[PDB]
Short mmCIF file of C-alpha atoms in Angstrom, two decimals:
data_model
loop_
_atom_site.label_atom_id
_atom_site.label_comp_id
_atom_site.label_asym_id
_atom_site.label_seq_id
_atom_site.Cartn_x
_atom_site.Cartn_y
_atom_site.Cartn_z
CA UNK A 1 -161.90 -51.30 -42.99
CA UNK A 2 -161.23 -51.00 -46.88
CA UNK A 3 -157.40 -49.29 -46.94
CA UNK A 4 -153.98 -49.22 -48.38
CA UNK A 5 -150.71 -47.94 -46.85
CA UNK A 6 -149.19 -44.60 -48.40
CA UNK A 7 -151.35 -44.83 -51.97
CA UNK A 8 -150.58 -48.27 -52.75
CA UNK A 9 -152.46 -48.69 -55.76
CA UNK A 10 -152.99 -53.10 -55.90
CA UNK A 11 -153.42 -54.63 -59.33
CA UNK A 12 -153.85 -58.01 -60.42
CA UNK A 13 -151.20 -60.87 -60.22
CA UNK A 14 -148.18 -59.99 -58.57
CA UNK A 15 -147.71 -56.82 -56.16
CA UNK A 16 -144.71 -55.58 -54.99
CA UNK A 17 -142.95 -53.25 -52.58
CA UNK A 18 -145.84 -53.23 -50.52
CA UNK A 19 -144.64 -50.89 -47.56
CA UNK A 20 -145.44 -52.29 -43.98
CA UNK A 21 -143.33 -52.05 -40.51
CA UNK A 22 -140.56 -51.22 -42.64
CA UNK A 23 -140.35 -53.80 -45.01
CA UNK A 24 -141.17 -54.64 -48.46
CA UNK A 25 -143.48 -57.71 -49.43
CA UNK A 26 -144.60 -58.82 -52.07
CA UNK A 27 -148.15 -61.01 -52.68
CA UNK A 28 -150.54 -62.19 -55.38
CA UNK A 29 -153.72 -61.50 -56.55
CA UNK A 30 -156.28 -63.89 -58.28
CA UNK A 31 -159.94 -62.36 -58.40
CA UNK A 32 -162.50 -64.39 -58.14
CA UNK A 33 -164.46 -65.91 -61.47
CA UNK A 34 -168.22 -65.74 -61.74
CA UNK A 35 -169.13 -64.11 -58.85
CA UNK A 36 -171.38 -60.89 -58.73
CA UNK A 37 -170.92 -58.78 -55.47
CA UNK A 38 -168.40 -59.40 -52.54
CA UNK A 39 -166.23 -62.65 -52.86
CA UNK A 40 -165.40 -64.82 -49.81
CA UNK A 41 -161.28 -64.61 -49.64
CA UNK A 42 -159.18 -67.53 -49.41
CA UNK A 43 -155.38 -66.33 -48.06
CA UNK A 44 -152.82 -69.43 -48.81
CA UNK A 45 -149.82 -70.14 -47.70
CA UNK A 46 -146.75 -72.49 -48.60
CA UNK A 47 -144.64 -74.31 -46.44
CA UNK A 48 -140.83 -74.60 -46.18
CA UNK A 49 -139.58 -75.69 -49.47
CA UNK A 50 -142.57 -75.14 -51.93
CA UNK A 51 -142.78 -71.62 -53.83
CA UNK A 52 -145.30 -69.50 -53.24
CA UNK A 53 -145.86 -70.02 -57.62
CA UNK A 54 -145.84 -73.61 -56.46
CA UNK A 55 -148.73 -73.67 -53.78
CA UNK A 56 -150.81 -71.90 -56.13
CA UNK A 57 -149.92 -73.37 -59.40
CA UNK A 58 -148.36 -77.16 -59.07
CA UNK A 59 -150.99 -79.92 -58.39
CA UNK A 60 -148.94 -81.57 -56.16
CA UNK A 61 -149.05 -78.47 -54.10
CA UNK A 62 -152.33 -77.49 -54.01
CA UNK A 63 -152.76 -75.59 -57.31
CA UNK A 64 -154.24 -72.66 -55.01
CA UNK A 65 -154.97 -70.27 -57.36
CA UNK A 66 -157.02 -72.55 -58.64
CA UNK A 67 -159.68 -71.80 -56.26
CA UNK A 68 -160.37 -68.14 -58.15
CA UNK A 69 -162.18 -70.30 -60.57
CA UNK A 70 -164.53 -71.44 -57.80
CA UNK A 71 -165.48 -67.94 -56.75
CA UNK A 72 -163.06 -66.85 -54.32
CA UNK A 73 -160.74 -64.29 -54.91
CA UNK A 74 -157.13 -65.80 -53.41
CA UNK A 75 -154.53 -63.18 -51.86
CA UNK A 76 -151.00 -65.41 -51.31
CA UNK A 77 -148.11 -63.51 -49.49
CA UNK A 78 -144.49 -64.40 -50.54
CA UNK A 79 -142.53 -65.44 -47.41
CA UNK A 80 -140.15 -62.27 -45.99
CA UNK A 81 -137.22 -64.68 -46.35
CA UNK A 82 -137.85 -65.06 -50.11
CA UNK A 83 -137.07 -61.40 -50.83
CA UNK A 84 -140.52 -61.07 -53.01
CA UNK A 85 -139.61 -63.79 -55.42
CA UNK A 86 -143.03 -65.76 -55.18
CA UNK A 87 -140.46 -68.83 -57.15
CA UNK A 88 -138.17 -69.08 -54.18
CA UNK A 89 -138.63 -72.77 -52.52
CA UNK A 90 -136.32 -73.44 -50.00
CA UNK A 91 -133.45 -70.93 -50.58
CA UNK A 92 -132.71 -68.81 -47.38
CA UNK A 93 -136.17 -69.66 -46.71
CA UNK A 94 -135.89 -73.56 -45.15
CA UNK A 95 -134.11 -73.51 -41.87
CA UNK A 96 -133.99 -71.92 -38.58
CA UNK A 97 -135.90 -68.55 -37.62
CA UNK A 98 -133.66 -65.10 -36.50
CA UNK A 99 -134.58 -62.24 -34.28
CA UNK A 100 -136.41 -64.18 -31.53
CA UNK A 101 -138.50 -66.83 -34.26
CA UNK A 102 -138.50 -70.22 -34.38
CA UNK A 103 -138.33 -71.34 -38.17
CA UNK A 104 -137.53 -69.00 -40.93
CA UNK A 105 -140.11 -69.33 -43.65
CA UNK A 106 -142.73 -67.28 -42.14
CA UNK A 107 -143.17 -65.75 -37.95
CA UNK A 108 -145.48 -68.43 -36.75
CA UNK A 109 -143.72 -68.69 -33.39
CA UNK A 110 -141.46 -67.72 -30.76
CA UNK A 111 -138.05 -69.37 -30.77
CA UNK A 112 -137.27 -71.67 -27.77
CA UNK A 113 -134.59 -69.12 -26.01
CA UNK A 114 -135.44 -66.63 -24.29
CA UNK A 115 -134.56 -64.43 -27.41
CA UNK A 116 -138.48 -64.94 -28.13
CA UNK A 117 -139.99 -63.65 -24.91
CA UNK A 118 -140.66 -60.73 -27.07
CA UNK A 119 -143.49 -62.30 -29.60
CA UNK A 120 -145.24 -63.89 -26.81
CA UNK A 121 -147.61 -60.69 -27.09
CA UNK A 122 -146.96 -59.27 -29.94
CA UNK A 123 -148.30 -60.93 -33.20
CA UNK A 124 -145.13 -60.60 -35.06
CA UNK A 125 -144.62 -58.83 -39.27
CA UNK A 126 -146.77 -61.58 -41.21
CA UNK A 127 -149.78 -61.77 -39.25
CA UNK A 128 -149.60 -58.16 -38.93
CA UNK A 129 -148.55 -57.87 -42.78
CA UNK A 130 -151.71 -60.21 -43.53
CA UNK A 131 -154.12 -58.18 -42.34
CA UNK A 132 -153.08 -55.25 -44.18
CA UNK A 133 -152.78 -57.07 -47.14
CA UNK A 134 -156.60 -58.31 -47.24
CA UNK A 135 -157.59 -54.46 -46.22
CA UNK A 136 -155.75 -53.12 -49.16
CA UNK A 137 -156.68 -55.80 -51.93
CA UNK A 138 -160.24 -54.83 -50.61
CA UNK A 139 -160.25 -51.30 -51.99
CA UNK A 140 -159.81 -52.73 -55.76
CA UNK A 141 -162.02 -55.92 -55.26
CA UNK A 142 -164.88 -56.21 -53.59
CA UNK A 143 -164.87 -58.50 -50.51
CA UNK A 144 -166.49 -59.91 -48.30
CA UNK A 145 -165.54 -58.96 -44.66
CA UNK A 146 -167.13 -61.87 -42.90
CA UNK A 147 -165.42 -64.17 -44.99
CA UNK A 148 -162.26 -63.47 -44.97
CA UNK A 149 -159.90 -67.35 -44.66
CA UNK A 150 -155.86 -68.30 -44.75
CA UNK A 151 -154.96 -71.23 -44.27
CA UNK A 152 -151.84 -73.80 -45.76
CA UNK A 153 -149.61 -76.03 -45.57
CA UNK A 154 -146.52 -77.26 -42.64
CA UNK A 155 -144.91 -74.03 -41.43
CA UNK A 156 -147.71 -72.12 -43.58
CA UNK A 157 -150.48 -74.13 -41.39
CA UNK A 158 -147.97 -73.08 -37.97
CA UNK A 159 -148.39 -69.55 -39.29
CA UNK A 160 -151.92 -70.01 -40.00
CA UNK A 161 -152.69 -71.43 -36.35
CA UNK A 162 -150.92 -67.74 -35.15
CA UNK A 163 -152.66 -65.77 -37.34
CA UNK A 164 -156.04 -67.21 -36.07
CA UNK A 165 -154.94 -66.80 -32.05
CA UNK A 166 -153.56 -62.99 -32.73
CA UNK A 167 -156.47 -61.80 -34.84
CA UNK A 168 -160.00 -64.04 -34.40
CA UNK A 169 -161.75 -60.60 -34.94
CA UNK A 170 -160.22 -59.79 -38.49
CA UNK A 171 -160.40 -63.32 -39.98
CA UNK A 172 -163.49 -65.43 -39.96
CA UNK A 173 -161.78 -68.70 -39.87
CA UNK A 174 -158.84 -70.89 -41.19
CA UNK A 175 -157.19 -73.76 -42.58
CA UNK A 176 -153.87 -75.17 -40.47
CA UNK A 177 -152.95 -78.19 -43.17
CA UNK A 178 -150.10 -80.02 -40.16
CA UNK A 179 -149.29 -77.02 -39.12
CA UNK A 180 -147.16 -76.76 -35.78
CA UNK A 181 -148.20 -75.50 -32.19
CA UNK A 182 -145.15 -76.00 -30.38
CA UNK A 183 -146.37 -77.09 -27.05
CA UNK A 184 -145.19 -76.03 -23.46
CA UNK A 185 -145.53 -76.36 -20.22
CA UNK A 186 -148.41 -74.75 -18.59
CA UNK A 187 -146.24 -71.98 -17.60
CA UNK A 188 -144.89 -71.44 -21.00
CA UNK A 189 -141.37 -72.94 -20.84
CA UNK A 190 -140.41 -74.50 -24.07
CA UNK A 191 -140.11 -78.01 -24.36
CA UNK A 192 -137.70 -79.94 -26.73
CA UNK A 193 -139.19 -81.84 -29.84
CA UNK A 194 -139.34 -85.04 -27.42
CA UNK A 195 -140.83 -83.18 -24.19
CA UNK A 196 -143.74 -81.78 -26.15
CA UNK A 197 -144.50 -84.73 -28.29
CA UNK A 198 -144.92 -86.57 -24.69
CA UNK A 199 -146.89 -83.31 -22.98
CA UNK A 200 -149.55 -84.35 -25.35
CA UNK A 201 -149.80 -88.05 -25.21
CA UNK A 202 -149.78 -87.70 -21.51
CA UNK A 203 -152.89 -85.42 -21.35
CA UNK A 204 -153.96 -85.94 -25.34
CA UNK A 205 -157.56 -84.31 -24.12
CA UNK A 206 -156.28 -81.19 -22.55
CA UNK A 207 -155.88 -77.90 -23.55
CA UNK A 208 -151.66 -77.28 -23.97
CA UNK A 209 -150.22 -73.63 -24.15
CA UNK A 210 -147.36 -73.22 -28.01
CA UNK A 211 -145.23 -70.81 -28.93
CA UNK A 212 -147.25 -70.52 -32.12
CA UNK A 213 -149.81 -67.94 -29.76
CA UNK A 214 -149.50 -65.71 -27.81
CA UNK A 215 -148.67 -66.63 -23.87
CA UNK A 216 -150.83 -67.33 -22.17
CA UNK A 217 -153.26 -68.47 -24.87
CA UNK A 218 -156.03 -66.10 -25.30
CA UNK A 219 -159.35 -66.83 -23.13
CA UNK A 220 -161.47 -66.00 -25.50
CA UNK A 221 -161.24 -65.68 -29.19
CA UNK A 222 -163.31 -64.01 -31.64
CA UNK A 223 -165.72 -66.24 -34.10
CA UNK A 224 -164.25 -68.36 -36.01
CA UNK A 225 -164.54 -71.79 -38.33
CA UNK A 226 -161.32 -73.64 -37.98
CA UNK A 227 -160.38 -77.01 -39.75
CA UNK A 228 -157.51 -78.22 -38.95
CA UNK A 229 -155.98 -81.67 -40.90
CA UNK A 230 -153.74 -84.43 -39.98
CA UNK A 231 -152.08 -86.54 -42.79
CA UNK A 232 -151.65 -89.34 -40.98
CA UNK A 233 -149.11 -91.71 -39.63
CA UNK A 234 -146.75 -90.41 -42.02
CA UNK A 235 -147.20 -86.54 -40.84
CA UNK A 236 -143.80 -86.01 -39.78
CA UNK A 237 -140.66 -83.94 -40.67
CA UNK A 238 -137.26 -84.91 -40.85
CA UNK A 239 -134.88 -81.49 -40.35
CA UNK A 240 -131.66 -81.46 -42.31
CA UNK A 241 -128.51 -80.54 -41.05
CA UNK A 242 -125.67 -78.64 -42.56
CA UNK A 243 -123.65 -81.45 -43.39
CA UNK A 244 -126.99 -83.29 -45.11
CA UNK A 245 -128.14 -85.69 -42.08
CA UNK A 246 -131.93 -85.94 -41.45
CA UNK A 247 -132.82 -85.75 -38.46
CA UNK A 248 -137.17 -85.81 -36.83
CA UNK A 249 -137.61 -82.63 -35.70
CA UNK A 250 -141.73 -82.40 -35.65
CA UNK A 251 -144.57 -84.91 -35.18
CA UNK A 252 -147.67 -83.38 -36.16
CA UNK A 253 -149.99 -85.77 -34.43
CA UNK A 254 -149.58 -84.02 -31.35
CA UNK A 255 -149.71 -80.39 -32.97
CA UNK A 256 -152.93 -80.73 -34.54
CA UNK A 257 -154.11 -82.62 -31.48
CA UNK A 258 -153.39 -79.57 -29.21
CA UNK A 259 -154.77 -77.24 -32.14
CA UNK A 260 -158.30 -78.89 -31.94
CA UNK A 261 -158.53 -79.66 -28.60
CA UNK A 262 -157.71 -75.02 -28.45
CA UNK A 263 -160.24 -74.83 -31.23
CA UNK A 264 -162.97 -77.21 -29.97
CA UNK A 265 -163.40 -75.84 -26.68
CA UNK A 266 -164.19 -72.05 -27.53
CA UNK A 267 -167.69 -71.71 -27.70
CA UNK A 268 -167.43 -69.03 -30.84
CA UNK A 269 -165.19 -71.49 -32.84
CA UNK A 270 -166.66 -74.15 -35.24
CA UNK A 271 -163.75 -76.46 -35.07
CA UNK A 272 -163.63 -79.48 -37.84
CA UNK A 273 -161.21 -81.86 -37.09
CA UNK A 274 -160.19 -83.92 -40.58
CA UNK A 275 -157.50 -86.76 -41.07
CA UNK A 276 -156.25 -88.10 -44.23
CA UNK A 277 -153.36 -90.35 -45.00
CA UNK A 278 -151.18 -88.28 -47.15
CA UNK A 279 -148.42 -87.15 -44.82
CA UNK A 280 -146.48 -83.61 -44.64
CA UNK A 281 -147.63 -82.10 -47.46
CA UNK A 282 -150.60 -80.82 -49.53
CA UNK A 283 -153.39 -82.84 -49.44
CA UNK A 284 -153.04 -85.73 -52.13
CA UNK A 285 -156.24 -87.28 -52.73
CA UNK A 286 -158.66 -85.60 -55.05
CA UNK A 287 -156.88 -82.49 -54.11
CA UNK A 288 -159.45 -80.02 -55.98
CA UNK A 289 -162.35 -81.96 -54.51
CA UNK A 290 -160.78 -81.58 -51.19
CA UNK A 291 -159.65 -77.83 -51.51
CA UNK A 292 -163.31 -76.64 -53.51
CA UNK A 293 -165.22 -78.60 -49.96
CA UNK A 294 -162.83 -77.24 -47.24
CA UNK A 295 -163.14 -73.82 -48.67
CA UNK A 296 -167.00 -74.09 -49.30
CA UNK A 297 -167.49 -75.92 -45.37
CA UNK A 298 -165.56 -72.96 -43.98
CA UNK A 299 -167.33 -70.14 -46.50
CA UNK A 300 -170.37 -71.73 -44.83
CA UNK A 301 -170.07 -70.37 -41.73
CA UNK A 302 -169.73 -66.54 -42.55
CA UNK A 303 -167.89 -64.87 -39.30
CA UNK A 304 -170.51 -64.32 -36.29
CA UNK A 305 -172.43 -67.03 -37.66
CA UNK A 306 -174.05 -69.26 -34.80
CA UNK A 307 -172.16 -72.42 -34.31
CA UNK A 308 -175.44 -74.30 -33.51
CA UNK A 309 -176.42 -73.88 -37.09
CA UNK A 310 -173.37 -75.24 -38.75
CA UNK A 311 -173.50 -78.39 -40.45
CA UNK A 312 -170.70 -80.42 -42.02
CA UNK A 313 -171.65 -82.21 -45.49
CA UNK A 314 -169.17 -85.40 -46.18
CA UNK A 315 -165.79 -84.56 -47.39
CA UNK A 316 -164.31 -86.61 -50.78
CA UNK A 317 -163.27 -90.03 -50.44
CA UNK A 318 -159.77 -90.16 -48.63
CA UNK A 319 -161.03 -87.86 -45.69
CA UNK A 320 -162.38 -88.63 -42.16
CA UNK A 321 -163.75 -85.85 -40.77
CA UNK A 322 -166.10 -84.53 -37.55
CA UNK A 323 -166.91 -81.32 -36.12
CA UNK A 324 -164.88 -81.47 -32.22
CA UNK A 325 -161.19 -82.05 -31.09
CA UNK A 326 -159.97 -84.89 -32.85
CA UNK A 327 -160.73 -88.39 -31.14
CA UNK A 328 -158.53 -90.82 -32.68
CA UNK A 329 -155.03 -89.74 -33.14
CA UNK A 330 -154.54 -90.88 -29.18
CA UNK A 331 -155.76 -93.83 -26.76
CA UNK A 332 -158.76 -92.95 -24.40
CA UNK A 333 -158.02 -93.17 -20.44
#
């Protein structure tokens, strides 16, 4: 599965004009250190306002690239909105989505109008883009095609949780850091910021169709080791208007709520459910030691793997986490 559109020939660092539905992106390369063969493949993604330089350089971010050290080779795409400057934060990038999506920084999910009917079956440019990204860094690094993981941070964790529902069979698991679902009714109406953050606590245990997915969520998805992580009380986002108000416009409890409850109950998905108490953004404590034993726990169920033989080793201090939907972000009945 080892190919790249029209000759691309991918190097090292940053790549550029990378041709695919008719536009041009832009995404960077860090092989893996000290590995002999095919590396696992971690795929990273930045949020709203971070860089794509600053999720895989700045502590504070994640210092992703960071992970090449630990054998993985790391692939990071540049959001479409910042024109393949990987040093764009939140220019043209933080706000509202166009052409039928949501939010702008990457197409993670279907806007609330009905000028997203269109992406509820139809995985949208970045997954898509993704995909042929990993395929075509493939041909100048060896991989390894049953470890193959994305996974970051706010809208980079939304886009992370549609990446995973639109193509289980390419990717052999993930890592949606408070990453949105944007629940709806059963019937897939949108719901306001208020109606869905109450859809959950009413039925916190139940499965709840977003328009992260696809519509109606698949039945079945492909194998997969998802860990999705909650930051806490604190994991919340306040929206900005144009005059400079802030405004709450997501609650994450509920979105990773509805994300593992999704995960949990596939019988070909290894779902970890972790909490922390950083808030909306990278995690904060012993960031390395977090990011080296997320990557490991999910590199350690290689894709097709049997879920009965998975078996989570204790995270670093500042982490609670359990393999299952997660059990204490809501009352029990």
């Amino acid at each position: 599965k080892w190919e790249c559109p029209a000759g691309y020939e991918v190097k090292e660092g940053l790549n550029v004009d990378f041709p695919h539905k008719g536009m041009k992106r832009a995404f960077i390369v860090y092989p893996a250190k000290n590995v002999s063969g095919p590396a696992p493949v971690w795929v990273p993604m930045t949020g709203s306002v971070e860089s794509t330089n600053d999720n895989l350089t700045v502590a504070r971010s994640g210092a992703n690239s960071i992970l090449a050290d630990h054998g993985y080779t790391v692939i990071a795409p540049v959001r479409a909105c910042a024109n393949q400057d990987p040093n764009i934060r939140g220019e043209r990038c933080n706000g509202p989505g166009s052409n039928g999506w949501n939010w702008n920084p990457w197409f993670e999910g279907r806007a609330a109008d009905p000028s997203g009917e269109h992406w509820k079956n139809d995985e949208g440019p970045d997954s898509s883009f993704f995909v042929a990204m990993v395929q075509c860094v493939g041909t100048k690094y060896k991989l390894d095609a049953r470890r193959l993981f994305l996974g970051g941070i706010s809208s980079g964790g939304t886009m992370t949780n549609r990446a995973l529902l639109f193509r289980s069979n390419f990717w052999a698991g993930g890592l949606p850091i408070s990453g949105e679902w944007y629940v709806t009714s059963d019937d897939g109406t949108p719901l306001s910021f208020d109606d869905a953050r109450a859809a959950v606590a009413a039925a916190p245990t139940k499965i709840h169709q977003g328009r992260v997915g696809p519509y109606p969520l698949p039945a079945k998805v492909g194998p997969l080791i998802v860990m999705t992580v909650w930051g806490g009380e604190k994991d919340l986002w306040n929206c900005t208007r144009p005059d400079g108000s802030r405004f709450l416009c997501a609650d994450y409890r509920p979105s990773t709520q509805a994300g593992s409850n999704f995960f949990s109950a596939q019988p070909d998905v290894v779902h970890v459910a972790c909490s922390s108490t950083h808030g909306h953004m990278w995690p904060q404590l012993n960031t390395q030691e977090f990011n080296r034993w997320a990557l490991d726990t999910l590199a350690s169920h290689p894709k097709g793997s049997d879920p009965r033989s998975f078996k989570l080793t204790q995270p670093p201090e500042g982490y609670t986490c359990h393999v299952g939907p997660f059990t204490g972000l809501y009352a029990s009945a």
